[PDB]
Amino acid sequence: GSTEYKLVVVGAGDVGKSALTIQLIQNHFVDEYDPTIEDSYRKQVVIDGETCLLDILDTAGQEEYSAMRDQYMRTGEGFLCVFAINNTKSFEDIHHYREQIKRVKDSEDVPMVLVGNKCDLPSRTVDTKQAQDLARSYGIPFIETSAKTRQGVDDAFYTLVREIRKHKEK
Ligand SMILES: C=C1CN2CCC[C@@]2(COc2nc(N3CCN(C(=O)/C=C/c4cc(CN(C)C)c(C)cn4)C[C@@H]3C)c3cc(Cl)c(-c4nc(N)cc(C)c4C(F)(F)F)c(F)c3n2)C1
Ligand SMILES: Nc1nc2c(ncn2[C@@H]2O[C@H](COP(=O)(O)OP(=O)(O)O)[C@@H](O)[C@H]2O)c(=O)[nH]1
Ligand SMILES: [Mg+2]
Question: What SMART domains does this protein map onto?
Fold first, then answer.
């Protein structure tokens, strides 16, 4: 059978969670996606020879800390922590997402990838070194992406799958 990987895309509003997801799923860049639509999308993919079923949760809606919401988010096996490279606030929010994920997974060792999205844009306010340094602080990979050009998109999600595989071998 296919191994299913439950991947969760998190990050501040407008960083490109939906656009990254749709690029992975539909191979198309979406200029506009309703920011209140949270949905899960599936795609069968081959990663390192293995046929995988990716289940991608594109998070949306008001932040909510309830048992129900935590229970749901806790089903994620790996998390893309997305900021936009032209939005310093979205970068400064990353530790909040990291902290919430560690909380609901009750683990310091959750499969995670730091994603700096919108690298196609000229107006970057978060330089690569600071983002690499934050990923190093967390012990996780850092991948620069563009949902618009597809730069890094496969790498971001596939790296997350490889992280989950490695974690499950403990
Ligand atoms: C430091 C902080 C704490 N918050 C207070 C200040 C802000 C902050 C948010 O903080 C914050 N915002 C979350 N929003 C709201 C904002 N977004 C959006 O795309 C909304 C975009 C948007 C865009 C537009 C259009 N524009 C152009 C304007 C409009 C009109 C409206 N909306 C992302 C996500 C759904 C959020 C979502 C989730 Cl699921 C979780 C979460 N909850 C759990 N229970 C457990 C876990 C393990 C998580 C985690 F996995 F995700 F981690 C959080 F933790 C979250 N925290 C960041
Ligand atoms: N130029 C560029 N724009 C992007 C990229 N990713 C997302 N966007 C745009 O940023 C806006 C918000 O993207 P969206 O996926 O809705 O962000 P979300 O709130 O995190 O789901 C939309 O206009 C997208 O077209 C990217 O890699 N490059
Ligand atoms: Mg969205």
Answer: RAB, RAN, RAS, RHO
Q: In angstroms, how far is CA 162 from the centroid of its own chain?
A: 14
Superfamily of domain 3-168: P-loop containing nucleotide triphosphate hydrolases (3.40.50.300)
| Cα 46 to middle of ligand 1, angstroms | 31
Cα first-last separation, the chain: 22
d(CA 15, CA 59): 12
Number of helical (H) and strand (E) elements in the chain, helices listed first: 6, 6
Nearest CA to ligand 2 atom 12: 14
Tokens of 69: 């919401």
Token reading at 65: 């800390």
Q: Is 117 in the pocket of ligand 2 (CB under 6 A)?
A: yes
8: β partners:
57, 79
Domain residue limits, the chain: 3-168
- What is the experimental method? X-ray
Helices (H), 7-152: 17-26, 67-74, 88-92, 94-105, 128-138
Q: If you search the block for the tokens 């690298």, which residue do you land on?
A: 119
